[PDB]
Design a protein around this nucleic acid. Sequence first.
RNA 1: UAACUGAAGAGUUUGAUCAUGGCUCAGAUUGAACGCUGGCGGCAGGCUUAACACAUGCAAGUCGAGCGGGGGAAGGUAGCUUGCUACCGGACCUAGCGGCGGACGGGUGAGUAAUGCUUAGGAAUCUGCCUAUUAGUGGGGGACAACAUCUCGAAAGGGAUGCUAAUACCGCAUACGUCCUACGGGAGAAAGCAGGGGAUCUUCGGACCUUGCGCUAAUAGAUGAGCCUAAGUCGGAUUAGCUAGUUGGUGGGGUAAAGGCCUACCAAGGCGACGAUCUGUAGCGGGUCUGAGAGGAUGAUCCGCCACACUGGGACUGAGACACGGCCCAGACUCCUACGGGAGGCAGCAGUGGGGAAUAUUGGACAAUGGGGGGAACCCUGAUCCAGCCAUGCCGCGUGUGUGAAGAAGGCCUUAUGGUUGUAAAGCACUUUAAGCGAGGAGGAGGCUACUCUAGUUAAUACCUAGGGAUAGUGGACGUUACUCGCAGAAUAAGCACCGGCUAACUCUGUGCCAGCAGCCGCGGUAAUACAGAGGGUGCGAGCGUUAAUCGGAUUUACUGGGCGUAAAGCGUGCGUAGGCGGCUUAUUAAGUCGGAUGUGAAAUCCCCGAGCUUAACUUGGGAAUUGCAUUCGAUACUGGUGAGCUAG
Lengths: 86, 207, 82, 79
Amino acid sequence: ANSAQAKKRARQNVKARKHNASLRSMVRTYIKRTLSAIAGGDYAVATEAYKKAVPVIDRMADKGIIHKNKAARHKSRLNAQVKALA
Amino acid sequence: ARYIGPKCKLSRREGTDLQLKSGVKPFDVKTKKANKAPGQHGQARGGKQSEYSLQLREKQKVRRIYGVLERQFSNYYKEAARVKGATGENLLKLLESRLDNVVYRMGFGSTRAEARQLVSHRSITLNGRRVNIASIQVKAGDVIAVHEGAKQQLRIKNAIELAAQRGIPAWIEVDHSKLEGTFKAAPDRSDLPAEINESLIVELYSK
Amino acid sequence: MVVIRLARGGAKKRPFYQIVVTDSRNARDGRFIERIGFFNPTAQGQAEKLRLDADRFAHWVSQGAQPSERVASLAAQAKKAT
Amino acid sequence: TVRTLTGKVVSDKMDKSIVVLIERRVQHPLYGKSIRRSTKLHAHDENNVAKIGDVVTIKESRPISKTKAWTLVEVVEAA
RNA sequence: UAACUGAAGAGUUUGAUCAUGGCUCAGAUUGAACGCUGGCGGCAGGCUUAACACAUGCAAGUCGAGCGGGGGAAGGUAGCUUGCUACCGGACCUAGCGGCGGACGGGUGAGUAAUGCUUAGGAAUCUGCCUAUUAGUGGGGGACAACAUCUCGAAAGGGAUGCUAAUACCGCAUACGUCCUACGGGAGAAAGCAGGGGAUCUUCGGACCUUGCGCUAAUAGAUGAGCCUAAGUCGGAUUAGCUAGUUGGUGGGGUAAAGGCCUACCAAGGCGACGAUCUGUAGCGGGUCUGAGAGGAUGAUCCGCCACACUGGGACUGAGACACGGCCCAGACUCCUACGGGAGGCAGCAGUGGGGAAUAUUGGACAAUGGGGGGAACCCUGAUCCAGCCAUGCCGCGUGUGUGAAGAAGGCCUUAUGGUUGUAAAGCACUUUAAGCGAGGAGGAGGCUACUCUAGUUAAUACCUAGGGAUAGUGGACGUUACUCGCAGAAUAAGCACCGGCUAACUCUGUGCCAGCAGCCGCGGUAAUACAGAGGGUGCGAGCGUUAAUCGGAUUUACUGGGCGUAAAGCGUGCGUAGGCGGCUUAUUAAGUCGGAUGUGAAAUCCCCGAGCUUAACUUGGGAAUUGCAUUCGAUACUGGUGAGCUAG
């Protein structure tokens, strides 16, 4: 059943899967570190993590790895939780 | 299809002259057996008949004179029922408006059978067209003319002689020298003979 | 995209087209948004050949619909006619 | 022009919610007799203003929980 | 002008009779099958059973104007034992990377009794290609297929190392819009390619300018999809209790988006006699058949929605799939193998086996209408169109017409003479439909190239985008097309059922309670009009009969529209719960009820008036209709709600 174009589609699918997985893992790592700082509870340390995390989220949202609505939700909620610290 | 068979058997069975013998001699002189049915058990017309029997004989009588088979007759009756007005009279108008019957009543056919063959062989023309269907219904204002090949025919000459012997109906007007005539409108019920009864047929189909 | 095109109908050997506005992904003789005229290639006697509604045509063309080539030619014919 | 339905409160146990029984009268499709019909609808009342026995009016809204999509408007008749 | 005009009964219980009551028959219809028979054309239909298993071929490709390599045919210059060699660049082609498509189009009805469908509404959402508008497209870098080398295996396809371009990927710069914001501020993009001309002019075949196709951020439209509420939608009580994320709230998580969608805690809720839970069966609507109507039966072919793709569980990529001809895992099955290893899913069109009473070609073309790609040329398309087969249905046509008895011959009957086949046949005259042979010949083709003009680009009458006119060229599978005109001659062409009553049409012979016929009453023991043949008839007709199935007759489930003393049928009798119904007067409300307006009720189908088909079927233009649903404004006699009064219950 397979044809040349179908096989080509499958190979491209594999490559894209690996690339997108790496970038999305980067996003999650930064968000997790920001949450860890919030748990630590120091206002300055938490805001520094927030500043260092926001650009990566914006970049991958622009690339389309995640949706811009999800990026905005993350930024809003993280900023609120950082502000509640102090 | 068509019914090809003896005509006088059917005429005697119906009990009345159907006018399928061109009338050159009297029908009585030709058949010399009227009032007696053709068969071993043929009995006089005075024998009693059932209600369904009379209802059936009426339809058979009309069908035999007008040369129409059962399927087309039933379609005609349903069409008359759909059409507004008296269904029985509409049915007779539909039968009268046939191209071959109109050719007969206009006077270029010795018999309705002969008119059927003329139409089938394209010796007749509706307006300027060489039609070849006898079931065509002729609308008001139509012009039944003869074809050039049909003209100069001994059979046609004899047919117009017989037509001159006969009386042309009022609604048709045909010039025999030009071999063409025209149709005004559907002949009225009063013009149609009173021998035929249509109510029996209407009840037959209603049952 | 939204298109204006001809949907087939009638009988064999004698097609009769409805001019319809539809989404291009729908089947030729299936779902449509609006019917705005007809086209009879073999009209004879009193039969009318082309009837196109210019108001709706202009409205849909303004809303971004793309006519097919045959419908564009017929629209030109109707523009010349009227 | 929100759709509005008037009924009477029948429950108040839940937090920030009320249950109202709504009744309609329609003719029978085959026999024509006027017959009673009723439905129970869950509503949202943030301040717990309504209680059991009162007549209330409710309107349609976006879902607030799995079963609640209607909101209180006014207490027509206090119990 | 119109859009409806419609209702029939018969047979059988008894020595008679009336009623009750079941059975049987006359009608319409079918995706039908079988039996006998069989000429033509037009329009439609054609595996209802095994969602059984599948040989073989075909059904998703296109772009070199995104990119680097590679290949063969030609051309030119210089040298030559025999027209050739050695090198050069131009056109052409494509295995690979990349873009778009592949999620449409096509098939089926297994599952699904509500996660679905129909009708009417709503707010919390995303949306490639298309249309309109706004602000841009700056400058760098690392991979990596191809390719080269080495290897495994018979091959199919695998493994290792060294290269490499880009509209493949990633950083930096900038930000009208855009996102977060504690309102102070912070954050995030993109890619080039083609052509023309200034005749400027080369950090080299360059740099500058316009145009076009592209690319990035954003708003709106359109389209498509996701989500929510109300009413409606099959049988069973010999199925009465069911539910612990269960019902609700708070913090957090998660989604494009509301939400127990997920989670920790808190509370004990939530559903059910207006049928919860359980169980059986089933895709649903527009429609279709039947019927005077109410109603009943039904979901082939046409259209909308849903679900599914050998069985089950998953995600990936992408605007969009949890994807019929994509990927992974498990199961069953099948195939190749050189035993090291591999491959597959017709409920896509043909076709094969099996099943069954039963349903067709392993055909042609992209010419027409659509779909994918492309700037175009053009390529792909079992969608589609066209052809083949089948009386399967409907409609039309033919199988000759006129003649002519001194009533021929023959068969059959007979009260042995006469009657019936019978104007029938023979003989006479005559035309030629359809088919058969020969020549012409429309339309489905709109259009495109060639010449030359008007408007726009703005440095540029160049290039390119829109309009026009006649010609020349050009393009059709069906197609020896429809259709028209010539010649021969009645020459090529009719069967099936039935004849006691229902029910139109009766006799002889052979045979006898045997053979047999039979829908019901019935017929058959030597004078059967009911059995077999024959004559004559009757009803249909390229058809005629039987079987199977639904509605009707059936007022035998009775809403329209039935019954319970003796025919079937009042519980052995009370009391009472839910429910149904409820006296008189008055004021108020406007739920029931009634009236008006707006929106909606897709198209096709039904009916009415027209048009094109030689007619009819059929196709088609408009109207009516869709008898409903929702919103809103009005009326208050009756029913219901509320307040008050009264006495005949």
